[PDB]
């Protein structure tokens, strides 16, 4: 358990999303979408949800876990659309 | 079709956007529309006769009495603002000079003077009230009547002061008979008979012209110089500061009545023969006032001088209008 701030692509607002220290970027992404997709952002299923540290554009590989990301509690992360 | 206007039709083409005063005060009486039949009834009714005789037929003539305008430009709304403030100050004087027991500080002599010369004024002040309220109902134009309207209120205003003050005095000095005695004094005191004759006789002059002169140009400055100016200088040098201030507060009222009488006289002089007319009326009444001022001020301390100043002050009023 680990809070992060979710900056979801094409949404107007940063939100608080509790994640797990053991989640994959993929599973972070999916926890974030829950609060964005079909609320304020149209799904994109030609697309793949990716995670980059907000402060400096660093893109995290899909399957890296939070534990290893070296995040600061409450750190802000872009949840973006790629392929 | 008839176009919408910028103002009351009777005021169209004035150059200046008409004021509140012009808007609510003007060309209002309607009995003037049919001099032959003032009132929408039989023309031989006593009241038709009354208006023809005493308004239409006045020797004091003008082509358009409705042109008259009040120097102070008084309307009900403004009259109440003015007088509420001036009442706040006088009621404030009453409240606070009592608080400090001003009445207890007065000399036994001055108290006797108060009973003789001061509290009987309720009668004379009420008479003026009546006087001005008659001017109201016979003057030949709304703007004139309105001036008389407010004067009458002020007149009742002074009676009210005088009534109030009389209980306070009877309260402070029960053995004196304040509140009980005044009628008899008014009716039987040489000091007051000068005035009571003047006023009783003035009060049956029915011509609006003569009533206005008799009351406003002759009687009023005499009551004003004797009862307010003279007794006020005396009040004050006698240790009665309340009356000194009271009287001075009431004289503001007087000067405003003077202002509009002045204006009306000015207006009357636009027309030939009116100066002569007015002067004839003064010359009839002036001796009655001379008598009034003599009988009153002479029983005052320093009586002879009071007489000389009041005579010339009340005269000065009328000289200043020509």
């Amino acid at each position: 358990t680990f809070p992060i701030m979710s900056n979801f692509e094409r949404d107007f607002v940063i939100q608080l999303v509790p994640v797990d220290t053991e989640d994959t970027m993929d599973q972070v992404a999916e926890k974030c979408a829950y609060h964005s997709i079909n609320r304020r952002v149209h799904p994109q299923p030609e697309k793949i949800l990716r995670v980059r540290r907000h402060e400096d554009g660093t893109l995290f590989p899909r399957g890296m876990i939070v534990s290893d990301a070296g995040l600061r509690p409450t750190e802000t992360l872009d949840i973006i659309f790629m392929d | 079709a008839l176009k919408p206007l910028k103002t009351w039709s009777h005021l169209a083409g004035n150059r200046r956007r008409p004021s509140e005063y012009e808007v609510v005060s003007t060309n209002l009486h309607y009995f003037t529309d049919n001099p032959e039949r003032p009132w929408e009834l039989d023309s031989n009714l006593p009241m038709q006769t009354w208006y023809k005789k005493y308004c239409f037929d006045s020797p004091l003539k003008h082509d358009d009495w409705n042109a008259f305008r009040d120097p102070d430009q008084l309307v009900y709304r403004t009259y109440n603002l003015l007088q509420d403030g001036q009442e706040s100050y006088v009621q404030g004087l009453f409240d606070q000079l009592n608080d400090r027991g001003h009445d207890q500080m007065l000399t036994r002599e001055w108290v006797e003077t108060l009973a003789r010369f001061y509290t009987p004024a309720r009668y004379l002040f009420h008479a003026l009230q009546m006087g001005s309220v008659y001017i109201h109902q016979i003057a030949p134009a709304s703007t004139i009547t309105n001036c008389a309207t407010y004067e009458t209120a002020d007149h009742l205003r002074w009676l009210t002061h005088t009534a109030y003050r009389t209980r306070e005095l009877a309260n402070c000095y029960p053995d004196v008979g304040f509140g009980k005695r005044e009628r008899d004094v008014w009716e039987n005191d040489p000091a007051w008979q000068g005035f009571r004759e003047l006023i009783e006789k003035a009060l049956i002059a029915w011509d609006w012209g003569e009533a206005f002169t008799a009351i406003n140009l002759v009687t009023k400055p005499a009551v004003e110089e004797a009862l307010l100016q003279q007794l006020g200088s005396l009040a004050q040098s006698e240790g009665d500061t309340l009356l000194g201030l009271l009287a001075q507060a009431q004289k503001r009222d007087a000067e405003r009545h003077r202002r509009w009488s002045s204006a009306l006289v000015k207006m009357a002089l636009e027309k030939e023969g009116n100066r002569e007319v007015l002067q004839k009326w003064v010359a009839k009444w002036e001796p009655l006032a001379d008598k009034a001022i003599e009988a009153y001020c002479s029983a005052l301390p320093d009586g002879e001088n009071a007489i000389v100043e009041a005579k010339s002050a009340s005269r000065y009023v009328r000289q200043m209008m020509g």
């Binding site: - | 005060s25 309220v133 109902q137 309207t149 509140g179 009060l203």
Partner: protein, 491 residues
Amino acid sequence: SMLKREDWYDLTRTTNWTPKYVTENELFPEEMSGARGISMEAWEKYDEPYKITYPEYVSIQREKDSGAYSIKAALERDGFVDRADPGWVSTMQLHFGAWALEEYAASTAEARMARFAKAPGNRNMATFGMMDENRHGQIQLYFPYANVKRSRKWDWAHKAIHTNEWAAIAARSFFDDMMMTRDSVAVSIMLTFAFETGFSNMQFLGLAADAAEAGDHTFASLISSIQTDESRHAQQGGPSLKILVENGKKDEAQQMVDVAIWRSWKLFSVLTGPIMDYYTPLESRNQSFKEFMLEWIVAQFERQLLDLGLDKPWYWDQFMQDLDETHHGMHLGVWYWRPTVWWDPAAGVSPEEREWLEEKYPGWNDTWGQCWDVITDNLVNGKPELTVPETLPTICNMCNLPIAHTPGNKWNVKDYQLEYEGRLYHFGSEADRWCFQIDPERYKNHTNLVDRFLKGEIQPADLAGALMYMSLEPGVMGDDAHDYEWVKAYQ
């Protein structure tokens, strides 16, 4: 410290004295005081029930005007008048015309008492009454004045009583009679008691509710403020009646009341009746003019009269009956002759309207309804010319109002004629005629509009002439309030 008003009050009204240098009758001429051979000292028993002193007056009334004016200012720029019901707009243009100057003239009436009443308490109250009616006149000009750019009709707030348009003569006929041409003691009975206590006070209340219900808050405030001043000078008749009755003159007292009420009633039956049942929209209608009169005017006269030791007037039952009839008469008159008045009269005979009418007055469609039937058919059938007039109606010589009563299936229109010294007079009711008869000296040579037309005083002596004589031109001449909109509902 201040005093308690109770302690010093009486000295404000201890103002009587015995004249010497002139005589009591010189000082207080009978033609203006009407002492009635009752002594100065018997008159000093006169005791008004509601008391006020100058400081209290100028204070209170300063704050009244602060409000009424502040409302006006606040609401002004929103221009409600422009989107008000036109039935409403008319009501206002009628009101200001009819009252503004009569209110102003009222101060003089008050002034009469103020000088000539032998009861000192009365002279003082009439001074305040004088102030009151000043205000009313004044304020009831300032208010319409905001609307002079919107229509010429609003000039009539000032012009009306200066014209010989038939309503205004009707108006002056009442007022001059009641208040301007009668002695002090008489004025206190006929005006303050009969008319102000009897009708104005309740009316003004009703009028304020209505202004509100229609969402004219300026006017609502305006009317209701005036009304707060009424009982202050309105009281003044009652004490007079007490001294008169307790004295010797219960008969003389009576008669004035009898007259005074009937004359008011007839004015009221054309100025208020029509408005209640026809100008105010259907859902804004709380109660009929008849309901209103019964609830708020009739019971109270009876109440008042009983306590003063007086009788119900001889004409009472007739009066009661006439509540079903008279006003619908005046309304048809006004509407049918709508270009002779200075507001736009509201027809008031839509289907819905017509059932309400029949609920409140059973038999209405089978009497009054008949005339409006023809009126309607004509406007459906593209003949409007048959709903404007080509002649004058017979004017009652007393009340200067059209002679009119029940039409249709139960026709009962009557003229209470009288020949008097070689002239034939026309009267709209028994009581109207009786008014003339008891005091003929006072009405003898007055000429009503129709007399004037007939004596060749109106030139050209046709309708367009009479229209000029009444100072009425297109654009202030009245027409149908809703522009015949209500006709559509019949095709």
